[PDB]
Write a structure and sequence with these properties.
The structure is a homooctamer. With about 110 residues, chain A is mostly helical. Chain A has one domain: Hemerythrin-like (Four Helix Bundle (Hemerythrin (Met), subunit A), Up-down Bundle), CATH 1.20.120. Chain A has four helices and no strands. Chains A and C meet through α1 and α2 of A and α1 and α2 of C. The complex binds chloride ion (8 copies). One chloride ion binds next to α1 and α4 of chain F. Chains A, B, C, D, E, F, G, H: GO terms for molecular function: iron ion binding; oxygen carrier activity. Chains A, B, C, D, E, F, G, H: Keywords: Iron, Metal-binding, Oxygen transport, Transport. Chains A, B, C, D, E, F, G, H: Hemerythrin is a respiratory protein in blood cells of certain marine worms. The oxygen-binding site in each chain contains two iron atoms.
Amino acid sequence: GFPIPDPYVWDPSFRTFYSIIDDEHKTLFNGIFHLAIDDNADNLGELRRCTGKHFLNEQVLMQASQYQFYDEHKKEHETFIHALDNWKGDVKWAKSWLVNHIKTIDFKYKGKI
Amino acid sequence: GFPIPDPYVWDPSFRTFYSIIDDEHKTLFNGIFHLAIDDNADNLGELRRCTGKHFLNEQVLMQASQYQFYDEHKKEHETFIHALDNWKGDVKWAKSWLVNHIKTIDFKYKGKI
Amino acid sequence: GFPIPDPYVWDPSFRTFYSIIDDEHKTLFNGIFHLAIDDNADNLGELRRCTGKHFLNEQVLMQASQYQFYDEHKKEHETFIHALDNWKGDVKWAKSWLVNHIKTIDFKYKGKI
Amino acid sequence: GFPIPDPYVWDPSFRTFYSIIDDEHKTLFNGIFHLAIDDNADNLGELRRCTGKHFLNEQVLMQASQYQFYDEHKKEHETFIHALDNWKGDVKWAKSWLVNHIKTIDFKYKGKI
Amino acid sequence: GFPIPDPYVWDPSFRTFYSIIDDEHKTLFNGIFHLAIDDNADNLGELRRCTGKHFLNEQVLMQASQYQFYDEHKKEHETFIHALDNWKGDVKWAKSWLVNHIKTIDFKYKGKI
Amino acid sequence: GFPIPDPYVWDPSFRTFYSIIDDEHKTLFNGIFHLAIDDNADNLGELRRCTGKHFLNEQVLMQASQYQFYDEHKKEHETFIHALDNWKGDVKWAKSWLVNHIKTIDFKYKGKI
Amino acid sequence: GFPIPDPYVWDPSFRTFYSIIDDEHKTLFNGIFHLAIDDNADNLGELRRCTGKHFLNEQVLMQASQYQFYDEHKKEHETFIHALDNWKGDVKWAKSWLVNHIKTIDFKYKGKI
Amino acid sequence: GFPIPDPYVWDPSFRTFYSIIDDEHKTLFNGIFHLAIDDNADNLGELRRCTGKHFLNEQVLMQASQYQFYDEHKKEHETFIHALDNWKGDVKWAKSWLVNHIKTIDFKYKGKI
Ligand SMILES: [Cl-]
Ligand SMILES: [Cl-]
Ligand SMILES: [Cl-]
Ligand SMILES: [Cl-]
Ligand SMILES: [Cl-]
Ligand SMILES: [Cl-]
Ligand SMILES: [Cl-]
Ligand SMILES: [Cl-]
C-alpha cells in the first residue's frame, strides 16, 4: 500500500541505512524502469543479474548476524526470481513487488544485520 | 557457579585470548545490560544481532581448526538464540547463561582454534 | 555533445561491460536525479558517498591491470569530487559532467581492466 | 556538553548506524570503564588495542567513500592515541574525549560512508 | 559447428567480456594444445588443474548473480571433468568440446553474471 | 616405508612445492615432536589445532582445482583426526602416519592444485 | 639464448611451480601471439591488460615474502610496460623479452615466494 | 640469556598466544635447524622466504591495532633480513637472534594486537 514512484527510480524513503544494500536497491529500480519502456531480453537480463546478485548479497548479510526472519525473507526472494525466470511481461506487478518487498520485508532487518 | 558482574559488563576474567572474540563478547554484555534496564524490542534486537553475529563468527573460527567439540558448542549457541527469539523477559537467566557459556563452554576452545 | 538523459537515469548506452562499475554508475545518476529536485545536504551527501566510493573502486580496478591512462583519469575524478565538496548548485553541469565522464573517460578503459 | 555515562558504558544514543562501528565503540567504553577502576598497564593495553584497531578500521571505512572530512577526523584519532601512549591517568578526560568524539566527530560521517 | 583453431590457441572470437574468465579460458586452450602434441600424464594434469579451477571459479561467478541456467551449465562442466578423469586420449573430441562449450554454453551467461 | 626423521622435524624431502602447505606441514612435525616427549593435553591440543587447520586448508586448496582424488584424501584426514580425538598415546604410529601421508597421499596432488 | 616458441605459446619448460603465475604467463604468450598476426589496438590492449595484471600480481606475491631481488625485478617489469605503452611494432623483441624474463628473472624467485 | 633449544625447534615457551604467529614461528626454527646442518642456498632460501613472510605478516597484525612499538619492532626485523641477505654462516648468532627476538621483542605485543 505504498506509492509507486514515477519515474520508477529509487528514493530515500526506501533507505535501509545499509549503504551497500541501498545502492543495490537503486539498480533494481533502474532495471525495472527500462523493462517498462522496452520489455526485451536484454533489459530483463540486466534486472535479472542485479536481482540475483542483490538477493544473494542481502541473504549473506542477513546470515552474517543469523537474522531471525531469514527463511521467510528468502522465500520472498525466490518468488520474484521465479517471476523473472518465467517472465510474462507484468511490469506493473514487478514495480509494486519491489516497492512492497523493500518497505515491508527488507525494512524488517533494520538494525538487525 | 561464577559471579554475575554488577554492573553487567565484560571484564578481563572472561578473556579467551582471542582479541576479536573478546571484543564480540564485550558487545553481548552491553546488550544484556540495556535489556535489563529497558526490556524492549530495540534492545533485544541489538543483543540479538550481536549474538547472531558473534555465534556465527566464533563458529567459523572453530571450524577453521576443526574444533573437536564444535557440535555441542553449536547446540549451546542454538539454545540462547532460540531463547532470544522466544523472549519471555528472563534477564537474570540470560545474564547467567552468558557468564557460564563463556567461562565453561567458550573457555574449552582456548588454544585449540 | 552526448544527450542528457531525461529523466536523469542510467541507461544501457552507458554500459562499460563491467558489472560492478555499471551498477555503481546507476547510483550516480540516481544521486544527481534527486539533487536536481531538492538541492539539499542529504541529497548531496548521498551522491557524495556513492561518488567517492565508485571513483575509489574504479581506481582500484584500473590499478589492478596498471591501466595506462590512470593518472589522467584520477585527475578527472578529483575535479568532480572537488565540485561536490564546493557545491554551488549547478545541477546542469553535474548532469553533463557524469554523462561525458562515462562516455569519453570511462569508456577508454574498456577491455583494459 | 553531553552527559558522561555512569556506569561508563555504550548506549543507543551513541549509534552511528554502522553495525561494525557501533560494536567497536562498545569495546572502547568498556576499556575506559576498567581503566577508571584499576589504572594499570593491562587495562590500558586492552583499551589501546581496541582504540588502535577501531580508529584504523573506521579510517578505512571513511576512506572507502573518500570521506570529505577524513583529515580532520584522523587528527582527532592521533590526539587520543597520543594521550594513551603518554598516559598520565586522567580517566575523566578520556571518558569525556570518547563521548564527545563519537557524538560530534563520528556522527559527522553518518550517511556518508 | 564452429571452426577448431589451428594452432589450438585462444583467440578474441571466444571473448566473454569477463577478463578473468577469458584469461582462464586461455589456459584451457594451452592445455589441450600440448596434450595434442604429447598426450601424457603431465600434460593431462596441467589441463585437469586449469579445468578444475576454471570450472569452479566460473561456477562461483555464475552463483554470484544466481545465474538462471547454472544447473545445466554445471552438468556440462561435470561431463568434461569426467572425461578428463577417465582419459582415453580423444584429443579431437576435447578440442571440439572446449570450442563448443565456450561459444554455445559460456556465451549464454554474457551480461548475466 | 619412508624413514622416520630423528629428531622428528620437517625436512626438504617432504616438500610439495606449495609454500603454505609446506609451512603447515612443519607445524605438524613440531606438534608430534613434543607429544613424544610429553604426551599431555596441551601438546595434543597444539597438534590437534594445527592438524585440523592444515587439513581444512589443504582440503580447500584441493577443492580450488576440484582435485580428482579429493574424496579418498579427505577420508585419510578424517582417520588421523579421529585418532587424535581418541588418543591412546601411540606416538610412533602418529610419527609414521604423518610421514607416509605427506609422501604418498599429499604428494599425489603435486602440480594438480 | 633460449628458443623462441613457434607457435608462440607457453610450454612446461617455463613452469615456475606457482599455479597462479604460470596461468598468468600463459595469457602473456597468447597476447603476443595475436599481436604478431595483427598488430592492432585491441590485441595490444589484451596483452597490456594481462601484462599489467600479471606484473602487479607477481609483484604482490614477491612482496608477500619480502623477495630479496624485488627491486631489480620491478624495474624489468616497468621496462616491458613502457615498451607496450610506446609500441613500435617489434613483435620479435617482445617474443624474446618475455621468454628471457621468465627463464632468467622469474625463475630467480623459485622457492622464495 | 635464554637457553638455545637443542634440537633447535619451536617449543611452548615461545608461545605468543596468536595461533598464526606461533605457527609461523615454528617454520623459522625449522629453517635455522637445517641451515646449521647444511649451510646452503636451498636451506637459506627456505628460511628467508619463511622469515620474510612471517615478518611481513606479523607487521600487518601489529599495524591492525596500530601497535605502539611498531617502528622499533620493524627495525629488528630488518636487522635479521639484512643478515640473511648478506649471509656469512653464523648459525650460532641466528639461533640466538630468533630466540631473543621472540621472547623479548615479540612478547611485547602480547595482548596488544
Ligand atoms: Cl530489494
Ligand atoms: Cl558468548
Ligand atoms: Cl562515472
Ligand atoms: Cl570512537
Ligand atoms: Cl571453458
Ligand atoms: Cl599433512
Ligand atoms: Cl612474465
Ligand atoms: Cl620471529
